[PDB]
Amino acid sequence: MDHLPIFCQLRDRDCLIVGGGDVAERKARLLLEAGARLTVNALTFIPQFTVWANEGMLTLVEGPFDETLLDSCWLAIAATDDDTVNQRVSDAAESRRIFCNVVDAPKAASFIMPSIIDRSPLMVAVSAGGTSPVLARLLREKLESLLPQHLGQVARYAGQLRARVKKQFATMGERRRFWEKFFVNDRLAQSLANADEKAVNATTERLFSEPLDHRGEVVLVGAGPGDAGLLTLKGLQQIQQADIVVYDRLVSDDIMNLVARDADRVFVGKHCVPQEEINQILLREAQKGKRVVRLKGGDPFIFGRGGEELETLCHAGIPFSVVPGITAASGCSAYSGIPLTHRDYAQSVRLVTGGGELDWENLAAEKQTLVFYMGLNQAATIQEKLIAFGMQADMPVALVENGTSVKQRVVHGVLTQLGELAQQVESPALIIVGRVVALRDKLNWFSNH
Amino acid sequence: MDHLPIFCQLRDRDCLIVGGGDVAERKARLLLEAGARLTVNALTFIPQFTVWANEGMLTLVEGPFDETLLDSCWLAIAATDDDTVNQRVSDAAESRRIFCNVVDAPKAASFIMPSIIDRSPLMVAVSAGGTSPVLARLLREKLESLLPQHLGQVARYAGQLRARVKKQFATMGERRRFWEKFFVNDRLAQSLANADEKAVNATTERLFSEPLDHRGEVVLVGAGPGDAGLLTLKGLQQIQQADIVVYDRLVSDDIMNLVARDADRVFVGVPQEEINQILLREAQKGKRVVRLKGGDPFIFGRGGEELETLCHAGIPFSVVPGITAASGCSAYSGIPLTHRDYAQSVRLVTGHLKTGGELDWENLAAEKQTLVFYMGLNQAATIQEKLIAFGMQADMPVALVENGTSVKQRVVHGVLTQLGELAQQVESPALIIVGRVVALRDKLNWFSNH
Ligand SMILES: Nc1ncnc2c1ncn2[C@@H]1O[C@H](CSCC[C@H](N)C(=O)O)[C@@H](O)[C@H]1O
Ligand SMILES: Nc1ncnc2c1ncn2[C@@H]1O[C@H](CSCC[C@H](N)C(=O)O)[C@@H](O)[C@H]1O
Ligand SMILES: [Cl-]
Ligand SMILES: [Cl-]
């Protein structure tokens, strides 16, 4: 082992940074977050240091390095651009047995600053001893995506339930299984973060009361339009914790590859399935005590029938939550170079589905961006009706097929060509009508296929 | 943060353990592996301390605590079962400004020892500060199952190449590019694990020979409406690797906590072409620039304007969509934007227009839609009067969602004839939702009522 990681308590302890530029500022922000009683000594200071000083958050000492500034110090950081100054700092700290980091020279000093993932009280630190700072960064990024934002509040609450857990679960078998359900419960972590103190006491009692086996709940998760990079952090966290994942055709294979190895999968796409059967599967699986994730393409509440699936659960007393996703309109817009709004082009964006019938005079009005979902089959009618109701024949149009995916295809033109531009694509595809479509020739950045 | 993690270099540095039982034995093994010059001071010692002392690996001082043994020390560990003695050690260490761990009292004294995942030279340390040892152990086990066992060989080889990388690549941008390729090459990792030096050298020589794009870039990133969990995975990647992040007031503090600590931050919460110049400015200097925008970049965010300069200015760019306020406020208020036959259209509408343009109220008042007004608080009374005048039913439900998706989220709701009054109960940022779907909140609301 090259270095020993320790987690220092710095609250109100004297620490010293030498240097007053951007590098020193980053280290100072870190030590302030840890509560250090901070002095910064430098020949000159960038303005953020005087802001902090005037706010009484640290002390500044302007001038050359004064090794007596270390006399009461617990940690030192040499953060200047001057190798000679940094070695003077490093030597003075060493003679005083003060752990010291030289920012530009990790093996020149007595401690290295790792990458940090802060979920205080829970903390994770990554370092390769200076051999691989980019790898430490790549691991830090992975860990930030995996650890829920409010995990620390759960951790603090856990330590307060320590003794109570021991007495109702004598066997360490059952006991750890409880903690496994506890650090995973969404209503608890939410009630804590939102300071909803009666839900915390409620969910606490429900966690103890219901059988240890049971963790029945349904999370509706928006998978986004296809690119697995467009899943939300929380959506990834939820699919990693699921006992069973219920999904359909519009959830991309790339998203499904992120689903936990041990999760049961239930495919409800597809000859066709009624929504009521899907509703009952969610009900049936949650009633067995499973943590259920219902993965839906795009956003669950935009033409996804997410509401219908949750009203079945509200009847049965099954807890649920919703993780929004990137709807097809947002994803296709970003990846085709067609902003849904721009300057004065559109006062409104309309997301419309292709029962009555569409209000064609309403759809034809000026200063809109129209986005048709499930409209390929009525495309020929859309062209004829918009033309008949006064939309200018030179209005730009675009179709985006498999938006955000590696096989995305975008075709475009004006409105008088829409009907047979639509033959050149298949589902899933969006139709975008409006002046913003012309911006594609300037803003297109994604590969076209 | 509760603690500051640091990785200490203990080679040939004096450390002191007080105590000589099983706890002290565990901690002594750690400090010996780190190369410490170790003294152990205890009334009695378990047999392993004899094995170590006979091999010359540490010094035993058999007897009560001698605080002068701290005089040359860099770290102290109090590992007895006597709380009076442990406190004497911690008091003596504190007077000398020596970081001290009291093993059975994490809240006392000045450092705690984390759980370690070892991929030397790569190491990952985990701790909950003694608050939840079970969570630390659970988290430690998943990190083990995520870090390949050969990652240490990859990091070892990187350290051996660092001097060559600094010599051959003039700029930090080029060196970073090299490492980003180096650390994801699966064949190189396999060749290192197999000690196949022929294959290692072949891949390495090709990596050194590749052109590296000196281009700075601009990425527009949708931060989402506030909950940091609603950042996209790709959006997190961008802000964790950015050189400079340009952000504004509608990006939440929690999202800014995910920006790389070494990134510079530029706040622009300021006219629009002022922002445009900053982006082009910083990208022309070869930096990875992220424009981090509330919600989605291309929905009432002026993202189009921010990009239209860079096309002929020769600067590459890309766009990462985000959760727009309508989608986030919908999910977190229990108000789906569509449902059954309630809405044929969702309309995202701006509430503030050009100094001469006005909304098409006849168009907005039509049935079977969900209206969502962005930046419309100041016009709420006008929205009520106009929607009523163009035929919307007086009892149409409405809701205002303030700071949607954040822990401070507030929702007020009523009917259209109350919209003006309801809007005075909230402040920016808030969304106005108008439509029959608002009545689903009583059944679908899961997040809070504040
Ligand atoms: N990747 C994609 N590219 C283009 N259109 C897509 C798409 N994914 C879904 N769609 C559109 O969405 C329709 C299904 S309705 C489901 C919409 C989903 N809830 C969402 O928020 O996006 C398809 O017919 C198609 O018009
Ligand atoms: N968290 C939030 N809660 C409610 N409204 C929000 C919000 N964040 C942004 N908004 C709305 O968005 C307006 C700014 S316009 C920026 C919108 C952004 N591009 C997006 O896609 O959401 C605000 O005036 C407010 O109406
Ligand atoms: Cl490193
Ligand atoms: Cl802990």
Numbering used by the authors:
A (entry chain B): 1 to 270, 275 to 358, 363 to 457
B (entry chain A): 1 to 269, 277 to 457
Copy the relevant paper text.
R260, which binds ring C C12 acetyl, and R261, which does not directly interact with carboxylate but contributes to the positively charged pocket that captures ring B, are part of the CysGA SUMT module. To test whether or not their contributions are essential for tetrapyrrole binding, we individually altered each to an alanine and tested the variants’ activities for dehydrogenase or chelatase activity. Both the R260A and R261A variants complement a cysG deficiency in E. coli grown on minimal media where SO42− is the sole sulfur source. Interestingly, the culture expressing R260A, but not R261A, showed signs of precorrin-2 buildup in its pink fluorescence. Activity assays showed that the R260A variant is deficient for dehydrogenase activity and ~100-fold less active as a chelatase. Non-enzymatic oxidation of precorrin-2 is sufficient to support complementation of a dehydrogenase-deficient but chelatase-active enzyme, explaining why R260A complemented despite deficiency for dehydrogenase activity. We next determined the X-ray crystal structures of the variants to test whether these alterations changed the relationship between the enzyme modules or their overall structure. Both R260A and R261A structures are similar to CysG and have a low root-mean-square deviation (RMSD) when aligned against Met8p14. R260 directly interacts with the ring C carboxylates, but removing the large side chain does not substantially alter CysG’s structure despite its participation in forming the active site. The R260A variant was deficient for dehydrogenase activity and significantly reduced for metal insertion.
